[PDB]
Amino acid sequence: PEIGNNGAEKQISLHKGQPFIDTQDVGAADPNTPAVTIEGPSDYVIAIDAGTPVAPEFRDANGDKLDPSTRVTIQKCDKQGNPLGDGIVFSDTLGRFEYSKMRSDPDYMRKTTTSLMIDEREIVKIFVEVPPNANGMDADNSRITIGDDTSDYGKAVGIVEHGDLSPAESKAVRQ
Amino acid sequence: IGNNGAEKQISLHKGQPFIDTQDVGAADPNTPAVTIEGPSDYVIAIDAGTPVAPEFRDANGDKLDPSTRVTIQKCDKQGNPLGDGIVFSDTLGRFEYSKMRSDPDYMRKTTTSLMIDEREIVKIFVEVPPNANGMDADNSRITIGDDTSDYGKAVGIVEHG
Amino acid sequence: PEIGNNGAEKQISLHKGQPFIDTQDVGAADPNTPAVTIEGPSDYVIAIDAGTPVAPEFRDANGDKLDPSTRVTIQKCDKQGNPLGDGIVFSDTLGRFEYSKMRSDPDYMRKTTTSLMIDEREIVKIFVEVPPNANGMDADNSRITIGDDTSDYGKAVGIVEHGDLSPAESKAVRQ
Amino acid sequence: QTQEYTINHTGGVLGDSYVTTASNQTSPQRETAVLSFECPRKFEEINYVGQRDATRFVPRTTESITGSANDDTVVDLTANIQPVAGEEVIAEQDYPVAVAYNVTQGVEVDVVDADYAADTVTLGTNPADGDEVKVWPIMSDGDVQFRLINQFGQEEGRVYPWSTPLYRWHDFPQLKRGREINLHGSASWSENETLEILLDAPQALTWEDSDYPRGQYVTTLEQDVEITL
Amino acid sequence: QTQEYTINHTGGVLGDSYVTTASNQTSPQRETAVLSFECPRKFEEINYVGQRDATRFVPRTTESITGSANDDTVVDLTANIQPVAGEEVIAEQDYPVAVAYNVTQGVEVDVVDADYAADTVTLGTNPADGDEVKVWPIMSDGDVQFRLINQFGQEEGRVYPWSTPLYRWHDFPQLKRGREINLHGSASWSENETLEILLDAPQALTWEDSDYPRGQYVTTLEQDVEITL
Amino acid sequence: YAADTVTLGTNPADGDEVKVWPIMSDGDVQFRLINQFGQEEGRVYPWSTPLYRWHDF
Amino acid sequence: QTQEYTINHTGGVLGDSYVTTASNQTSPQRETAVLSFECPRKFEEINYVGQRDATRFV
């Protein structure tokens, strides 16, 4: 057998069924909570470029799409669930995706605005603003995906083991 | 964090402080359905290829007569319009609201550039033919600029200070 | 908006409702266990000065104070729950606080004896010695507090992110 | 140019519109937003500084009981309790730890004392059977904090990372310089931007009851700020 | 010398001997080996490259019901369900999300729609009481991966560390260049060495049923490879 | 010790329940590492050692 | 710094949590995982060397 020594900067993507991610249900008129939480695993470094695709595909408990006036906001945080204004990306509305062809089509493929980085212990949150008198989010059917592996279109999330590279700490301090 | 540039990219909509709307009846051009104002010590910039997207509705939850007309228009202070600087003198038909924002093809852009000094006004006049239903502000929505998208553009903002 | 770039040496305090702290009930004649455990979070450095206030406010399950002959001992530990004789501070009796005015009054405010430091992965324990034929401790009502933010009197616990300063490692080795 | 004002949970320099109040939540322990102040149109900016600007925040809760034939003269509670800055005695406190009011007998009700160890309080009167009662005891076991909003419900930062407990807040004697409370952090904002004052605690606090004797608004906040005209 | 072929879950260039299939396991969630390909005697070597070689893998499962007098026209399932690349509509999909067959009435059974939210699907027909039925719905909630074997059942390495979910695999529209799937990793092996394609998922997939209308072999794999003669 | 056999010194009664914990044989043992995720990265030593031999020494 | 310890199928230096045991499987002959040891929070690292470290497994 033979396998190629693939580069440390591995091309990956994020989704629900992973250990360093979590979600929880949401009601209405309810900005403060992360519907979805992400955290940096230990001794790893994640990198999200500016042209990274984004793809929330939330649902209602009865299996429906929500009010497109709903808003989604990805946002970096300092440790301790402490958000920060700078570094925010993807302040979008829940409408205007066409989930059918969303990831499928590079046109519909909504990318981020600016670059981003996740040091080994950091947080990225996904806040949601639903107008009142509306249905709530259901975590069983909701989903997030970011990055585009497995396609000549779109970009992919970079990852690297912190212990391999020597300037990994330099890039971590650089943020 | 990487220090983001002052020329920030945003998109406009109903739920903001420096915007307002009010109901409209029929054959009421002078009344602005929607008003926008420049916040304090900020500068907004709207390029020529900026998307536009009204979603006016009837009180019963229906679209209006597509012969209806919409006109975005800049205004001097004191609610005073101007001929120059106007953009997007379009009809209420021919959008395909279902695929309007999502499809770049059905996405409609402006005609010429635009700028909003710190204290200035932009109005959105509407001309409905008579014997028609009026506008309902609860259901209507506006959006301009397409943040977080590859096509279209985004509204620039910068702190004057 | 504008926020001031507050110094890295942030002035803080400790209490029950935090992630890097824990407690558990205690019976009687029962020294060995930490009624309360503290641990250094990752890539942070905590500093406790010698004139730091201290404030245990333990209780009984029925909602009473315990025998004032009871003893409390804060104690630094090496890793692995391994205590150490040097570096111990606050060997006090459970009586003679007057919990009503304890933190409130600088007089009643009982301070530590000597300085202290917590490297990123270290432990500080709070052992308790209750005489027999007495009532046990109840974790629901017990509490610890140390440091005095929010008052011209008393001192505060210093904290710093280890990744910011270059001599953070030097001070960590210094202990 | 610059002044040093006080701002309250109602009206004041703002005008009762760009304030908003709200209660917390009980079953999901969550960092609710109990109060928030939006900078009006007319001001230029607002500042806020720690170790410079004093503060006061008296919260309470509400509970109820049911009259019975037996001479109760004591009620348990669902909230941890202590005296106002510590003392066994009533009417020496800076303010009453607890207030009680009888619906039938539209009168105040004094307080004798309490254990202040378990969730207990004494009543001096002898309520009748079937009579409805309300009580507004002190609140405990909570955290308070600040955050800023840029016109959109969209956070950018946090004034001070670490929360201060309301428990301690009640413990210190308020309104004494040298002993006055002064949080940390140095914030500043401008037109239509909001400061939210947030709460994390189990017990359901209140703002208005319309049957509370010692003033209309039960709880209160009174914070010092600096304003640029 | 070098060519670019396709290889399938049966025969093809190999000859049905140096393939082997297998089902997964349900109660112990374990990284089973559902398929494996052993390099035959005649070839020199085989290569495999990501972002160069396309792929397809349509899995399914099997379930059964029991006819009843009541007009069911709907069945629950034990597998998470969604449409093929997303759509509420049937017969627009690249392929049917689900197939049904009646043992008694040896005929196909159409499908109208489904909720696609809970484990649900509609049937267009009206099954009779006592009639036996089979259904081969889409599969979901799984992971797929690769590994190499050096003639002995003795692993030496792994093509790509991180598994890709079959869920996502169904989600993307297949067989479109630019949108075609292309995993990562660059493997290569030689005579009698094996590549195993492995599965981690709860639901029991299938390979053969002998009563499935749309072809004999229910599921399928079709992978691109490079070969040195 | 040649076939799967063992003697008992006692005389069990009818109906009595018994348990026995004999030696084990015919197996292989090995090591592997996991990086926090159930996700293998390598193997300590390729070739397995038999527990049979393990008991023999 | 460095020491030479023994580790057992229960507790020991770990504490009975970051151990886990399990039986094998009979009908499908498969490379089961009968035991596993997870490095706890408190240690820095663990090493393991052949022809240096003894062993027993009954």
Side-chain angles (χ1 to χ4, degrees), chain E residues 67-82:
Chain E
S68 66
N70 290 318
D71 57 353
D72 292 331
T73 63
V74 65
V75 298
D76 292 330
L77 295 174
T78 62
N80 189 359
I81 189 165
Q82 64 185 359

Side-chain angles (χ1 to χ4, degrees), chain C residues 131-151:
Chain C
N133 290 318
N135 290 318
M137 185 276 290
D138 189 1
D140 292 331
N141 290 316
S142 66
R143 186 177 64 253
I144 302 298
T145 61
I146 62 168
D148 187 0
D149 293 330
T150 64
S151 178

Side-chain angles (χ1 to χ4, degrees), chain A residues 2 4 11 104 141 143 150-151, chain E residues 51 167 178-180 186 188:
Chain A
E2 293 180 354
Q11 293 179 355
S104 179
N141 290 316
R143 186 177 64 253
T150 64
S151 178
Chain E
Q51 294 179 354
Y167 183 75
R179 294 179 182 179
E180 182 61 23
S186 64
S188 179

Side-chain angles (χ1 to χ4, degrees), chain C residues 1-6 10-15 17-20 41 44 57 59 62-65 99-101 103-106 109 140-141 143 145-153 155-156 159, chain D residues 45 47 51 80 82-83 85-88 116-118 141 143 148 150 156-165 167-168 171-173 177-190 193:
Chain C
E2 293 180 354
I3 298 169
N5 189 359
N6 190 1
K10 294 180 176 67
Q11 293 179 355
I12 64 166
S13 179
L14 282 73
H15 62 87
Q18 292 180 357
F20 63 92
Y44 291 165
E57 187 168 0
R59 295 289 183 272
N62 62 5
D64 289 326
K65 182 174 73 175
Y99 293 163
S100 63
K101 279 75 175 175
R103 291 187 297 274
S104 179
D105 191 359
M109 186 179 288
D140 292 331
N141 290 316
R143 186 177 64 253
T145 61
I146 62 168
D148 187 0
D149 293 330
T150 64
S151 178
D152 293 330
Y153 293 100
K155 299 298 293 296
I159 190 165
Chain D
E45 65 183 1
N47 288 317
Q51 294 179 354
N80 189 359
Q82 64 185 359
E87 63 187 1
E88 190 274 331
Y116 293 102
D141 291 330
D143 291 331
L148 294 174
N150 60 3
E156 291 186 358
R158 296 292 299 275
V159 176
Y160 182 74
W162 293 94
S163 66
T164 301
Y167 183 75
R168 184 176 178 181
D171 290 327
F172 291 167
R177 64 181 291 166
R179 294 179 182 179
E180 182 61 23
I181 298 169
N182 290 317
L183 295 173
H184 294 88
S186 64
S188 179
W189 61 89
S190 179
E193 295 172 352

Side-chain angles (χ1 to χ4, degrees), chain C residues 7-116:
Chain C
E9 293 82 1
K10 294 180 176 67
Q11 293 179 355
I12 64 166
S13 179
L14 282 73
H15 62 87
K16 185 177 179 180
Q18 292 180 357
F20 63 92
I21 190 166
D22 190 358
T23 186
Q24 64 182 357
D25 291 330
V26 176
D30 192 359
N32 290 319
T33 299
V36 176
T37 301
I38 297 169
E39 183 172 357
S42 295
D43 293 330
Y44 291 165
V45 176
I46 297 169
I48 297 169
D49 292 330
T52 301
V54 177
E57 187 168 0
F58 293 99
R59 295 289 183 272
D60 190 359
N62 62 5
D64 289 326
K65 182 174 73 175
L66 295 173
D67 189 356
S69 66
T70 301
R71 186 179 295 276
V72 176
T73 62
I74 297 168
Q75 185 175 0
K76 184 176 180 180
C77 299
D78 191 358
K79 293 180 180 180
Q80 298 176 351
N82 186 357
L84 294 174
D86 191 359
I88 190 166
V89 297
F90 182 75
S91 178
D92 191 359
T93 61
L94 183 63
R96 66 180 180 182
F97 292 102
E98 184 62 26
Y99 293 163
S100 63
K101 279 75 175 175
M102 182 178 71
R103 291 187 297 274
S104 179
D105 191 359
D107 294 332
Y108 290 166
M109 186 179 288
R110 299 292 179 90
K111 292 182 181 180
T112 61
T113 62
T114 62
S115 66
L116 183 63

